């Protein structure tokens, strides 16, 4: 049921000047679209969705966790901390940091939550616990964005991203209340309007998390999409490119998402 219908991903990535990796799963039939799906690509900010899921998993055993107030200093506010910079003088709860990390890609929030989990290895351990043997987080914000060709640090594959996203949003890896909270955070993302969402009809529900490393044409998005009248679709689109100064493209990600939906025979 993989690649029943071929799609022109090679031409797409050639025009982009790099590599595109796609995995998309129709959760009704199990049909998939797959292109470079087992190659590694940098996560960039996209690890933050899985980070929030890991925090939610912890919260299943710690009923006070989400409402715990976290204080932080000015040193925590690295580049791109749009929410947490507004609450420097007050603190934020763990849930608020989680929402900020997911929905605004907030970097300080992500580092504070990583600390709660025992760092990159702690998040990696959570991913292992749900059966993801591919994912690895190695570094913190901002160092994890280096996106060096061939470097496996801070990478996963489109396939493992999709598989893990499915388990967490639709499967049983989270308890039901936490599952819905994760979905709701993804649905409220603000940074993805020009990526997978651009390929998804406005009358379908969709949650996503983006990433943009800032070098080597490296950027990404993953999403869970609920078309009306049929089962949900899970998909991941990752890019990279050979040269440090190669620029990412949001349009290329949207285009790849369109091809994936077309390959699944989902009318969009
Ligand atoms: C994540 O990859 N980020 C955080 C933020 N938005 O995330 S995104 O997925 O919407 O792109 C901005 C870019 C990126 C990030 O952390 N970039 C670093 C800081 C800015 N200098 C380049 C590396």
Residue numbers in the entry: 25 to 57, 59 to 252, 254 to 294
Text lifted from the article:
Of the KPC carbapenemases, KPC-2, KPC-3, and KPC-4 are the most prevalent in resistant Enterobacteriaceae, differing from KPC-2 by single- or double-point substitutions at amino acid positions 104, 240, and 274 (KPC-3 H274Y; KPC-4 P104R/V240G) that change β-lactam specificity, especially toward the oxyimino-cephalosporin ceftazidime. Of the three KPC variants studied, KPC-4 has the highest apparent inhibition constant for relebactam (Kiapp, 4.8 μM; compared to essentially identical Kiapp values for KPC-2 [1.2 μM] and KPC-3 [1.5 μM]). Relebactam cocomplex structures were obtained after 16-h soaks for CTX-M-15 (1.12 Å, P212121), L2 (1.78 Å, P212121), KPC-2 (1.04 Å, P21212), KPC-3 (1.06 Å, P21212), and KPC-4 (1.04 Å, P21212). In the KPC variants, structures obtained from diffraction data sets collected after exposing crystals to relebactam for 16 hours were observed to contain both intact and desulfated (i.e., in the imine form) relebactam in the active site, at variable occupancies. Consistent with this possibility, in the KPC-2, KPC-3, and KPC-4 structures, inspection of electron density maps indicated the presence of desulfated relebactam, which could be modelled as the imine form of the inhibitor, with occupancies of 0.35, 0.33, and 0.65 for KPC-2, -3, and -4, respectively. In KPC-3 and -4 relebactam complexes, Trp105 is modelled in one conformation, similar to one of the two conformations observed in KPC-2, albeit with high B-factors (30.95 and 33.19 compared with average protein B-factors of 13.61 and 13.24, respectively), suggesting there is still flexibility and movement of this residue. In this conformation, Trp105 faces the DBO core, with the nitrogen of the pyrrole ring ∼3.0 Å from the relebactam imine N6. This is concomitant with well-defined electron density for the relebactam piperidine ring. However, in each of the three KPC complexes, in all of which relebactam was a modelled as a mixture of intact and desulfated forms, Lys73 is at least 0.4 Å more distant from Ser130 than is the case for either the CTX-M-15 (either conformation) or L2 structures.
Of particular clinical importance is the widely disseminated class A SBLs, including the mobile, plasmid-encoded extended-spectrum CTX-M and carbapenem-hydrolyzing KPC families (both produced in opportunistic Gram-negative bacteria, such as Klebsiella pneumoniae, Pseudomonas aeruginosa, and Escherichia coli), as well as chromosomally encoded L2 from Stenotrophomonas maltophilia (a lung colonist of cystic fibrosis patients). SBLs hydrolyze antibiotics via formation of a hydrolytically labile acyl enzyme intermediate, while MBL catalysis proceeds without a covalent intermediate. The diazabicyclooctanes (DBOs), including avibactam, relebactam, and others, are a new BLI class with improved activity against a wider range of SBL targets than classic BLI scaffolds. DBOs inhibit SBLs through covalent formation of a carbamyl ester to the active-site serine concomitant with DBO ring opening.
